[PDB]
Design a binder for this molecule. Structure first.
Ligand SMILES: OC[C@H]1O[C@H](O)[C@H](O)[C@@H](O)[C@@H]1O
Lengths: 160, 160
């Protein structure tokens, strides 16, 4: 569904910083940078996922644009600084706390003025229309998952 | 002071990852990227230093190349994953912390084969010739400071 997600929020980007809080294989972050983002911070504590991410980043030929952090998402939010323009939140079902996480990101001033938060959850997960200062821009349900995209009030339209 | 330091280890670089522990104002990491390093991870626990770093990062017009972590160096090392090509160390309890930090970095396999670990300390601080698998390559004293650079046994000779 990589192409599906990017057809929603992209397909191409104008640079910026990406935060992938539950990076997994690194797919989301890597493709985002590929499609136009400048750099990406990937957070994934899963030992097995690490090796895969490492290899995927090296295969991009622009590996230095990726920073992998082996830590819990909550911990990462309390240690990262600066601001992110695109945030990917695809937590495993049992650890999913989209609302709390976005509120934390906003409270820690980790979101850029023009920010987009892409959430991937089970199809059955209901999310509020507004979280912090963000609002749902798009929501698509395909297969057993649902992708919900939050953006800041006044987020600029995407250029085609 | 930076001109002297970089004439020792540079003066230019063709890409790579920088790690600036006990970053302070982040001056070394920023200059290293300006000279050719690809990206930098800076770790600084002090709140005032963090503010300064964030501001300096903006003045580079290439802020997307920096990742600032607000955490203890020890904690940071346990969360880092990529191999680093250039490491800057200027910590409190210099001699003690430099040895412990290099030992930790080496144990976590966070140093590239051709890594340069650059230590800036008071002129009187005496550092050991060897730490873990590293050894002193260069050491220069000027003004009221001393720069010591550690490298791995297989470090390649540098150009002039
Ligand atoms: O927040 C989303 C926006 O982030 C950055 O500004 C990107 O350059 C832009 O392409 C993207 O639409």
């Amino acid at each position: 569904v990589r192409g599906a997600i990017f057809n929603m929020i992209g397909p191409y980007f104008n640079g910026g910083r990406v935060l992938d809080l539950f990076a997994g294989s690194g797919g989301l972050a890597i493709e985002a940078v590929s499609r136009g983002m400048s750099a990406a911070v990937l957070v994934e504590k899963n030992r097995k996922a690490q090796a895969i991410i490492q290899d995927n980043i090296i295969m991009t030929k622009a590996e230095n644009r990726f920073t992998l952090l082996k830590m819990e998402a909550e911990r990462a939010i309390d240690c990262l600084t600066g601001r992110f323009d695109l945030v990917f939140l695809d937590p495993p079902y049992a650890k999913e706390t989209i609302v709390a996480t976005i509120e934390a990101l906003a409270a820690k001033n980790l979101l850029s003025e023009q920010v987009m938060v892409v959430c991937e959850t089970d199809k059955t997960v209901l999310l509020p229309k507004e979280i912090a200062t963000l609002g749902i821009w798009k929501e698509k349900i395909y297969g057993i998952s649902k992708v919900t995209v939050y953006v800041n009030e006044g987020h600029h339209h995407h250029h085609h």
